[PDB]
Symmetry: C3
Subunit: 227 residues, 3 copies
């Protein structure tokens, strides 16, 4: 669909602008809660605990059927929060996330068809990679901020280090197996911007109403990454 | 071409372990298949490591008609055709080549291609595939990697192969989206070459009892 | 353009270890090349990750016309052409990009692209490439992964690079399909920058003796 006044060049510039905006937010935040939610309504207490404990960011995974409604609820409850959608496998999901109010999408792997879709609809994508060939594919599409996933199972910090060496332009968001015990090892790598983590918002705590624990874990990581 | 994947998925889920066979002399598939079948494991993935694989599939299908027979190391459509004509009902590739997958669709045989990371999984899903080989399983990160793939991709079902042994197979089978694992240990070429039929029978009975107690 | 891969493979096979050089000051390549050659390793893969790489290739080719010189970190055809014009014998890439491979064909320079899993191997094989860099070797699963790849893909010849040291190189070289490994330890930035020519010479003599006794 064509918007009056918007040519292909403007769409490209817009996508670049959105990439820069997201990059700067990630670099400041350093840790992104990765949220898998059963009941959409649970996103409200969870967003409140995150925000009031100093972590105004959430990536809601489309692995749950509740994801789109959760994004819509959180967006309304927490206007200032950085909200992303994860597990985005195609352009239809990307669009649904955008409509609901997300300002970036993340995918577990790299699919150029998903990337082209996001570049067209004007939502930043940070796609998952785990080897040099996939990094090269992403670079060729003009992306530089990539998710590194699954981080620990793909070789952890030694893989990150091996991986960023040849590619000076990339910035990574390692996700998968990140905990308070290893997050600083990742963040020590200059080309790592932020890590994704589930432990501070773990489904086991959410489903069992353990809001005080979520709060404690959130405060702990916020202090740890930006002391 | 009507896909037999629902049938294959069910057979794999029942078997839990698929012998991955590298045969030197095709004739050797006959006693090997007899030992596998009579010890409770009526399945075989015959790898295309040499021309002898084609004859082996043909001999095995004649000797053990109800055996689940796949062909492995299938790198192109020509080999997929050779396997189909020999009597295999599915092919397996170590990695994912969409040109091979397309060729298999055209010639009409099911393929279970190998993947080992999220991007390759997404490539397969985009071509309509959901049953995938996870290879090489241990060298790619093992159960930790398997859990990372099945997690985001609820539709996939995996056949981990590579470094699977009786000491680690239970951990893989404990993951619901794992259908079965491929294993060479009970059909190791050394055992076949040396005619260690009693030992092959023992390893086969032992694994069948282990996975299907 | 007739490919020199035959010659390249023979040279790699003879050398067994290839210095992977990230150079800060192009002029450093002259003494470094001399020390490497005079101590038995007349080869260098100079990475384009360094701004000095093109000038270093030119200087080294003039100073050591018989040196095997590879240009590393080649991500597109523009760089490949720059490498060819500078005097490189071949180009190396950390991963596999069909666009780079196509450009190298056009330009007329051999490429040894990087791979680390079966799907990427199949992609390379489908473009007619058989000599491949296995990178990053240790972080991708090391010798267990190498064994997993060379098994189903008998035609490939590998150059493992990434985490290789005198303590682990023999384990790679013991695999028949491994031609040579890339290593940075004998040309480490710290040594080259600080002009530790005697230490570079020692390390070079030591590995040459180790792999070619
Ligand atoms: Cl994701
Ligand atoms: Cl992980
Ligand atoms: Cl296979
Ligand atoms: Cl393995
Ligand atoms: Cl390289
Ligand atoms: Cl890949
Ligand atoms: Cl490494």
């Amino acid at each position: 669909h064509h918007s009056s006044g918007v040519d292909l060049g403007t769409e490209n510039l817009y996508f670049q602008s959105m990439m820069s905006t997201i990059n700067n937010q990630l670099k400041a935040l350093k840790v992104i809660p990765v949220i898998a939610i059963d009941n959409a309504e649970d996103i409200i207490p969870l967003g409140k605990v995150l925000a009031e404990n100093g972590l105004p960011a959430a990536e809601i995974t489309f692995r749950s059927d509740a994801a789109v409604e959760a994004i819509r609820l959180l967006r309304q409850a927490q206007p200032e929060m950085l909200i992303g959608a994860g597990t985005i496998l195609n352009g239809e999901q990307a669009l649904a996330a955008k409509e609901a109010g997300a300002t970036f999408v993340v995918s577990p792997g790299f699919n150029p068809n998903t990337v082209r879709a996001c570049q067209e609809i004007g939502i930043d994508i940070v796609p998952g990679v785990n080897n040099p060939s996939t990094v090269e594919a992403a670079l060729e599409m003009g992306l530089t901020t990539l998710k590194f996933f699954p981080a620990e199972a793909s070789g952890g910090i030694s893989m990150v280090k091996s991986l960023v060496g040849p590619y000076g332009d990339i910035r990574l968001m390692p996700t998968g197996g990140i905990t308070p015990s290893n997050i600083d090892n990742y963040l020590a790598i200059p080309q790592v911007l932020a890590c994704g983590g589930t432990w501070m918002v773990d489904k086991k705590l959410v489903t069992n109403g353990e809001w005080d624990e979520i709060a404690r874990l959130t405060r702990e990581i916020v202090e740890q990454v930006n002391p």
